[PDB]
Scaffold this active site. Sequence first.
Site, short mmCIF file in Angstrom:
data_model
loop_
_atom_site.label_atom_id
_atom_site.label_comp_id
_atom_site.label_asym_id
_atom_site.label_seq_id
_atom_site.Cartn_x
_atom_site.Cartn_y
_atom_site.Cartn_z
N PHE A 164 -32.87 -14.09 16.70
CA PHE A 164 -33.60 -14.79 17.76
C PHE A 164 -33.95 -16.20 17.32
O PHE A 164 -34.80 -16.37 16.45
CB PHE A 164 -34.90 -14.07 18.11
CG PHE A 164 -34.74 -12.62 18.50
CD1 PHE A 164 -33.71 -12.22 19.34
CD2 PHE A 164 -35.65 -11.67 18.06
CE1 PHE A 164 -33.58 -10.88 19.71
CE2 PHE A 164 -35.52 -10.35 18.44
CZ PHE A 164 -34.49 -9.95 19.27
N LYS B 200 -33.85 -10.27 5.22
CA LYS B 200 -34.20 -11.65 4.86
C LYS B 200 -35.22 -11.74 3.73
O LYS B 200 -35.31 -12.76 3.07
CB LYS B 200 -34.66 -12.48 6.05
CG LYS B 200 -33.55 -12.76 7.08
CD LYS B 200 -34.06 -13.66 8.19
CE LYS B 200 -32.99 -13.95 9.23
NZ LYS B 200 -32.73 -12.76 10.10
N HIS C 261 -34.64 -9.53 13.29
CA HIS C 261 -34.64 -10.97 13.08
C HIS C 261 -35.58 -11.37 11.95
O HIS C 261 -35.26 -12.23 11.12
CB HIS C 261 -35.04 -11.65 14.39
CG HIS C 261 -35.35 -13.10 14.25
ND1 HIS C 261 -34.39 -14.01 14.00
CD2 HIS C 261 -36.55 -13.79 14.27
CE1 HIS C 261 -34.95 -15.22 13.88
NE2 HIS C 261 -36.27 -15.09 14.05
N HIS D 170 -33.08 -16.99 4.96
CA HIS D 170 -32.57 -17.24 6.29
C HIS D 170 -31.49 -18.30 6.22
O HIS D 170 -31.78 -19.47 6.00
CB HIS D 170 -33.73 -17.68 7.16
CG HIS D 170 -33.38 -17.83 8.60
ND1 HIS D 170 -32.18 -17.46 9.10
CD2 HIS D 170 -34.13 -18.29 9.66
CE1 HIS D 170 -32.16 -17.69 10.42
NE2 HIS D 170 -33.35 -18.20 10.76
N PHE E 25 -34.34 -20.73 17.55
CA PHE E 25 -35.08 -21.83 18.19
C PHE E 25 -34.44 -22.12 19.52
O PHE E 25 -33.22 -21.98 19.69
CB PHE E 25 -35.08 -23.15 17.40
CG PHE E 25 -36.04 -23.19 16.23
CD1 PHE E 25 -36.10 -24.32 15.42
CD2 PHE E 25 -36.85 -22.11 15.92
CE1 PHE E 25 -36.97 -24.37 14.34
CE2 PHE E 25 -37.71 -22.16 14.84
CZ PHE E 25 -37.77 -23.29 14.05
N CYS F 169 -30.59 -19.79 14.86
CA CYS F 169 -30.56 -18.52 14.10
C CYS F 169 -29.61 -17.48 14.69
O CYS F 169 -29.24 -16.56 14.00
CB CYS F 169 -31.99 -17.89 14.04
SG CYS F 169 -33.31 -19.10 13.93
O1 07L Z 1 -29.98 -22.52 12.69
C1 07L Z 1 -30.33 -23.71 12.68
C2 07L Z 1 -31.47 -24.17 13.34
C3 07L Z 1 -31.79 -25.52 13.30
C4 07L Z 1 -30.96 -26.41 12.60
C5 07L Z 1 -31.23 -27.78 12.56
C6 07L Z 1 -30.38 -28.63 11.86
C7 07L Z 1 -29.25 -28.12 11.22
O2 07L Z 1 -28.42 -28.96 10.54
C8 07L Z 1 -28.98 -26.76 11.26
C9 07L Z 1 -29.83 -25.92 11.96
O3 07L Z 1 -29.54 -24.58 12.00
NA NA Z 2 -30.72 -8.95 12.14
#
Ligand code: 07L
Ligand code: NA
Lengths: 407, 407
Positions: free
Chosen positions: A391, A328, A296, A333, A393, A161
């Site tokens: 913020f 969002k 976020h 997102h 993963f 993200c």
């Molecule tokens: O922002 C993200 C988080 C996980 C994620 C996992 C797979 C992908 O193709 C894109 C992704 O984008």
């Molecule tokens: Na933001």
Amino acid sequence: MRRVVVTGMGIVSSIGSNTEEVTASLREAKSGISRAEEYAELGFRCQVHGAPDIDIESLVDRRAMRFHGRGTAWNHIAMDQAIADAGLTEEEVSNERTGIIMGSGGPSTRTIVDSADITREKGPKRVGPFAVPKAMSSTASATLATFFKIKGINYSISSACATSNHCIGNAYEMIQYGKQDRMFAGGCEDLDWTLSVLFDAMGAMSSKYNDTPSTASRAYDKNRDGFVIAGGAGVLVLEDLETALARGAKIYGEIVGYGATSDGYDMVAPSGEGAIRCMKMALSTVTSKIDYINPHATSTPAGDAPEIEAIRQIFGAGDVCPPIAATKSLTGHSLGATGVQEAIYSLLMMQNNFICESAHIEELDPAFADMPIVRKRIDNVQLNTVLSNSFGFGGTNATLVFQRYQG
Amino acid sequence: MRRVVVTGMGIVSSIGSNTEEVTASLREAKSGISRAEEYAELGFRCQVHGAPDIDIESLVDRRAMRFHGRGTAWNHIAMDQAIADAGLTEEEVSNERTGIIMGSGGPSTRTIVDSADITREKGPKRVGPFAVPKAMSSTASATLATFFKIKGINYSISSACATSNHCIGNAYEMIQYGKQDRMFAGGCEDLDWTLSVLFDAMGAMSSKYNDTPSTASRAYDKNRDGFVIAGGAGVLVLEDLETALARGAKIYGEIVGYGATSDGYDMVAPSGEGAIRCMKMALSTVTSKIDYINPHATSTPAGDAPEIEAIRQIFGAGDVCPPIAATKSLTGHSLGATGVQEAIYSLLMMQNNFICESAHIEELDPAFADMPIVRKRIDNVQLNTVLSNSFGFGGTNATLVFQRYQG
Ligand SMILES: O=c1ccc2ccc(O)cc2o1
Ligand code: NA
Ligand SMILES: O=c1ccc2ccc(O)cc2o1
Ligand SMILES: [Cl-]
Ligand SMILES: [Cl-]
Ligand SMILES: [Cl-]
Ligand SMILES: [Cl-]
Ligand code: NA
């Protein structure tokens, strides 16, 4: 350190195919979320998405498309827009002092799956010879650097993200320290079932609002039940201040702070303290009050709350805290694209003297009743300094602060 | 700017599962390339690969594996090795002054394909809830940052073949400018048919040596016919000099130069002039002669030659040019892992006073007859400064220079 300004913007979003459409959507709280019929056909719980509505073939010619998946094609369109907005000549785009840091949260998952499928159905040759640049994590930088003849810095940052917030922050650093004078910074994400299913399988996306898709994304609502996925792209043109001034650039804002930290805690939930450190780092170089926070907040039970507590720790509660509005709720997102798109939304709100509603709050979560979450669009407000969090993963945090340039 | 040193190393490679095994392979020119039976079964032209031989389950516990694809599992092992080599305490690993920039050329393509397959065969729920962190481009940084409780910088850079060179270079910059005092830097790549097929379909990998797999990778040979793909990982621990000295660190070398440029030319072939600019940028901060060049050279007709011409432009030809030895002739090309692994090979050669043979040159390409390509291992040589190139799809260039620390 040199000062760094934003001199051009481009965007492909669920809420508009250019900055004018995006501004209208923000002003009128027009949701970009719709039913995803394909997700229902595949048996997903979540059956909503934020899909751009844009005719790629009309905007990117066939040979220019050779190495683009659909996320990086959107990014190409955003780059064309940003170049036109900035008024750059060909020589200003292509020179040793001008670079690109452009990322995505993942590459073209569709290219990867289609290639595996056709290998097994028709043989490896039938993958074709152009799949590698679509499938690689650096796709957004490689395709645009090659096509636009970029000669300086060329790479991608990814951080889930936070991706395009870190891309912008690192580009900012490059200019601050004198290594580059102009940077194209931002990112993108395709929207495809092969990506979305990964989030549906973890239960991360909204599924209780499938019959009212437009209101499924609802940051701070008591009954929020997961994020709504989106695709798109954004690009900022960044320049050192002297370069911008000397060529009569438009200045949408000055980048005045950048924070980047790590939670070192949980893969899929935030710790809160990492976010506090990240915002403090961004604010350490800022000498004006914050007039607006673009959080976020992705419309998740476990995500919206720790960020609010982090905000409360730094800014306090109630009227002394800057107004907070979660874009969002309108946009969904867009993963790799989120940071740069939110920078653009914040800069457009600054330009137009309004703060959008934090949309789809039918019943505010009582945990947030003390905070200045925007319930109705605020008009005729002069925004001078805006803060945006992302913020991601893996406990990855990025914050940017932009300021109205007044000398 | 602060000085920056390498204080620990870890590696999982086709030529060894730790630095001792890797050193032995380099000294004895022991190829890491073998037949890939699966590629033959799938109908590939290329039927060779560079596969690590390491028991992951014996080295990474089950809960620690929850979010790892096989590339990032190898990266976890390399990080454990680097931490042990550096002798770091838990507090030295986990603190606000210590970060991670760790990348891969792509994410777990196998996770993406398996997820798409199981969605269609058994339904989306059967993807399971742990696929996102494996499939995202930031997988290498997110998984390790979370598990090792990293609190400072946390993101991935990707740039195809250049990936882990840029990861190391950006980590170097962070320490130089005082933002972090310690960084874990490097990268990884899984080895999987779902990735390899993309390269086979473009005709990029060797196929005329399938019956003698060990000699298929043969940089500078007249009859080279494409690269040999590999998987693995590497990690360097980087520290500002004062931090290293004060804790009695081992110093494997000092990072003394870093170049990063962009060709802006072709997606899958180098321009040559971009590489010249990249090497010059790396060398601009270096005040000793170069004693060894670890080239990009991947064993391709179109790739090996422009780099040699770039080297000739900067250093000249014959004896006045530094010795050149292409380690990919032994190791294959591990994509995201290549840059950091080649840094490690170069630092190990520095430590052990030898330059490896540039392997599998049965007939030197006459175009390179004027260059000091190493035909037989050079012993009892004191290496003080070594240069390593990585030049990736999308015209992305990175060069690093390391120097023996003598004060
Ligand atoms: O922002 C993200 C988080 C996980 C994620 C996992 C797979 C992908 O193709 C894109 C992704 O984008
Ligand atoms: Na933001
Ligand atoms: O280094 C690379 C270059 C292309 C590429 C393409 C797909 C992928 O999964 C990984 C990759 O790594
Ligand atoms: Cl894409
Ligand atoms: Cl976890
Ligand atoms: Cl992996
Ligand atoms: Cl091209
Ligand atoms: Na190299």
